[PDB]
Write a protein that binds this DNA or RNA. Structure first.
Ligand SMILES: [Mg+2]
Ligand SMILES: [Mg+2]
Ligand SMILES: [Mg+2]
Ligand SMILES: [Mg+2]
Ligand SMILES: [Mg+2]
Ligand SMILES: [Mg+2]
Ligand SMILES: [Mg+2]
Ligand SMILES: [Mg+2]
Ligand SMILES: [Mg+2]
Ligand SMILES: [Mg+2]
Ligand SMILES: [Mg+2]
Ligand SMILES: [Mg+2]
Ligand SMILES: [Mg+2]
Ligand SMILES: [Mg+2]
Ligand SMILES: [Mg+2]
Ligand SMILES: [Mg+2]
Ligand SMILES: [Mg+2]
Ligand SMILES: [Mg+2]
Ligand SMILES: [Mg+2]
Ligand SMILES: [Mg+2]
Ligand SMILES: [Mg+2]
Ligand SMILES: [Mg+2]
Ligand SMILES: [Mg+2]
Ligand SMILES: [Mg+2]
Ligand SMILES: [Mg+2]
Ligand SMILES: [Mg+2]
Ligand SMILES: [Mg+2]
Ligand SMILES: [Mg+2]
Ligand SMILES: [Mg+2]
Lengths: 118, 113, 59, 205
RNA sequence: CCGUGAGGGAAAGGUGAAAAGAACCCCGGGAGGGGAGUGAAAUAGAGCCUGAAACCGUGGGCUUACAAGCAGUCACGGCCC
RNA sequence: CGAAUGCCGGCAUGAGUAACGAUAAAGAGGGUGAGAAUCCCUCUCGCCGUAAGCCCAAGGGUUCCUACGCAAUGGUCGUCA
RNA sequence: ACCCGGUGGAUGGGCCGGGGGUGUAAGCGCCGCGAGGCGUUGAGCCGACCGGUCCCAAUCGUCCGAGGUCU
């Protein structure tokens, strides 16, 4: 077994896997589009969406609970004042994932793309 | 008429390549071309290179109407290996042999009938 | 090199008789919507393949 | 021998004459008899049933809407009952009065490749003292030059679970004919949502 | 090359008569091929005379998925030449 | 010459199998390039910090610096060394 | 492998509701010299469980597949 459990283990342990996401996030919300392994992305969605949804509701407490994952004032700023808006009338899926048709060579990893919808 | 294009001494192990040289035997050079481009195997690359080369020979030297030829024959042959040394535990030492291939890809002209 | 070991040199027969499986399969390809180029399904093809969210095109 | 099909809602203790506890809610939805396999055209007696209605058309061709009851054919007509002959139309649920006894047959939980000692409760090894990478092995498996083989049924690790399993003489606590619901006594196999079937107890009857 | 040292101690010869050692064009980042050209000969093309056997292939003929095997042999039978 | 756990060389089998050498850890953007998980740059993350940092001695002997380069060497890749 | 989906669709992700687990977040106000305490407040946060919802993704397509020997 290891049935109804949900949540990829990415050949990484706690602190790594976590600090990993926080780095995918920071990237994704700075460049709007990132390219990674299909799986590393299929997870990124929820971690970010949350960050973004916490932005809409965007008050002080939200500014902070969000900061906990980005640590960076700027950007955290650019997210609440220029990203959050674009989605105020959108409920759900503030993030997209599109698979690429080519695989990293001398490794062969299936790739994907990740951009903030809209 | 037909046109071959043999890539000699390609540093890579046969059994590894024969794999793909088998994915394109007897096919539309258009078909092949495609398959290779999208095949997760180091071999793909090398076969392509050759394939695309006989394609050229077909056109340029034997007049063959590109868009009308297939892979009449293909097949990779074993070339002299590279005996390197792999040190083992307890002063053992082994001979790892880096093999090498001779990839042949000859072309033929499809029906036209 | 140790405890369990191969009792007999496998016959050329049985050798290839086991590799009867290693046979590699051909990729799964389909024609791109726009460009008359061939490409594997459900993928933002290598030639502007897709609509809406940027299709990482060749423009 | 009363048949019937049903998923398996969930579990929960109840209360009766003090002495609380302990049932497995399972719904024996309307089961439209879609065939009645005769001992003449078939050799034995039974009743194809069909469950979950559904299928706004994923239903290829074969379908078999033949019997004027194939109401948009159910997802799992799967299984007949055997030596059962209803009121020639849809099995109620009220086929069951409380206090009766039943038998549930279900697809057990899938435990994939299971080590010995779950699959068979083998004693395992000694966590300390000697030990050495055999903390969970099957130990020995045979004798020396005679027999020189291993018993046809020798227990070992492998796929374990996700097999048709049946638990008997389960007491029928209750039944809500309104919601097709049916309550029993915990012991019923499979996961939630998985399909199960309910016969009358083979105990005697 | 091995050994601190005394000392141990290998493997490795051959294009052609003459380099005439392959201009130039094509594929290729190269390597490598394909044409062209030299030559009596190019599977004499320089990891070069002859190039055997193990071993790895590609193609064709016969054959094989209810069959018990020191693998042959002796009979009949098909199929291919 | 068919046998000497014979000698020398070559090629098989196990096998695409065990491995790929500390569980300190990675992610992304932009370059260059025929070709980038592996090279340069930038941001983020992690590790050492009585060293996983500095200065000497021994030993090593061009490994230093720079330009041009990847056949081989690098346990993958390599435009890097 | 098996099973269920693939937009004429609730399959997964987000989101919302509910369970559930923590034990009453931050900010502000008041009391205390201060550590603190009180209120706002059972708050805040909240994986997996039960549901709802097309906001993101299952787009578009391709290849196989019988036409039944003889009394
Ligand atoms: Mg799971
Ligand atoms: Mg930690
Ligand atoms: Mg040593
Ligand atoms: Mg399971
Ligand atoms: Mg024990
Ligand atoms: Mg132990
Ligand atoms: Mg023994
Ligand atoms: Mg030439
Ligand atoms: Mg000669
Ligand atoms: Mg001579
Ligand atoms: Mg010779
Ligand atoms: Mg037979
Ligand atoms: Mg015989
Ligand atoms: Mg003798
Ligand atoms: Mg020998
Ligand atoms: Mg093995
Ligand atoms: Mg293994
Ligand atoms: Mg391994
Ligand atoms: Mg290493
Ligand atoms: Mg030097
Ligand atoms: Mg240097
Ligand atoms: Mg290398
Ligand atoms: Mg190494
Ligand atoms: Mg370069
Ligand atoms: Mg340089
Ligand atoms: Mg869903
Ligand atoms: Mg909730
Ligand atoms: Mg507070
Ligand atoms: Mg709806």
């Amino acid at each position: 077994m290891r049935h109804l459990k949900s949540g990829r283990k990415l050949n990484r342990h706690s602190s790594h896997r976590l600090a990993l996401y926080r780095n995918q996030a920071k990237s994704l919300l700075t460049h709007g589009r990132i390219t990674t392994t299909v799986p590393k992305a299929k997870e990124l969605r929820g971690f970010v969406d949350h960050l973004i949804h916490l932005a809409k509701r965007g008050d002080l407490h939200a500014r902070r609970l969000v900061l906990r994952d980005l640590q960076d004032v700027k950007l955290v700023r650019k997210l609440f004042d220029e990203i959050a808006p674009r989605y105020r009338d959108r409920q759900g899926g503030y993030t997209r994932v599109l698979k690429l048709a080519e695989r990293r060579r001398g490794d062969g990893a299936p790739l994907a793309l990740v951009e903030l919808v809209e | 008429m037909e046109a071959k294009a043999i890539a000699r001494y390609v540093r890579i192990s046969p059994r590894k390549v024969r794999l793909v040289v088998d994915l394109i035997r007897g096919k539309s050079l258009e078909e092949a071309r495609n398959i290779l481009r999208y095949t997760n195997k180091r071999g793909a690359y090398f076969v392509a290179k050759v394939l695309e080369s006989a394609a050229a020979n077909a056109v340029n030297n034997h007049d063959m109407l590109e868009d009308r030829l297939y892979v009449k024959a293909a097949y990779v042959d074993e070339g002299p290996a590279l005996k390197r040394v792999l040190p083992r535990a307890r002063g053992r030492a082994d001979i790892i042999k880096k093999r090498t291939s001779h990839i042949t890809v000859i072309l033929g002209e499809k029906h036209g009938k | 090199a140790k405890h369990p070991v191969p009792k007999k040199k496998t016959s050329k027969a049985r050798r290839d008789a086991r590799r009867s499986h290693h046979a590699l399969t051909p990729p799964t390809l389909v024609p791109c919507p726009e460009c008359k180029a061939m490409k594997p399904p459900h993928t933002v093809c290598p030639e502007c393949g897709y609509y809406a969210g940027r299709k990482v095109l060749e423009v | 021998m009363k048949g019937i099909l049903g998923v398996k809602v969930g579990m929960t203790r109840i209360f009766r004459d003090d002495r609380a506890v302990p049932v497995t809610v399972i719904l024996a939805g309307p089961c439209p008899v879609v065939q009645r396999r005769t001992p003449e055209k078939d050799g034995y007696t039974a009743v194809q049933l069909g469950f979950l209605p559904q299928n706004p058309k994923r239903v290829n061709r074969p379908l078999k809407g033949h019997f004027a009851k194939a109401g948009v054919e159910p997802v799992r007509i799967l299984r007949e009952i055997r030596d059962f002959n209803p009121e020639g139309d849809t099995v109620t649920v009220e086929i069951f009065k409380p206090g009766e006894r039943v038998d549930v047959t279900g697809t057990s939980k899938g435990r994939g490749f299971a080590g010995v000692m779950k699959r068979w409760n083998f004693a395992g090894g000694p966590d300390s003292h000697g030990a050495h990478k055999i903390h969970r092995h099957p130990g020995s498996i045979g004798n020396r030059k005679t027999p020189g083989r291993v018993y046809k049924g020798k227990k070992m690790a492998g796929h374990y679970g996700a097999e048709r399993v049946t638990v008997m003489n389960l007491e029928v606590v209750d039944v809500i004919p309104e919601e097709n619901l049916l309550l029993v006594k915990g012991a019923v196999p499979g996961p939630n949502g998985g399909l199960v079937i309910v016969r009358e107890t083979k105990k005697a009857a």
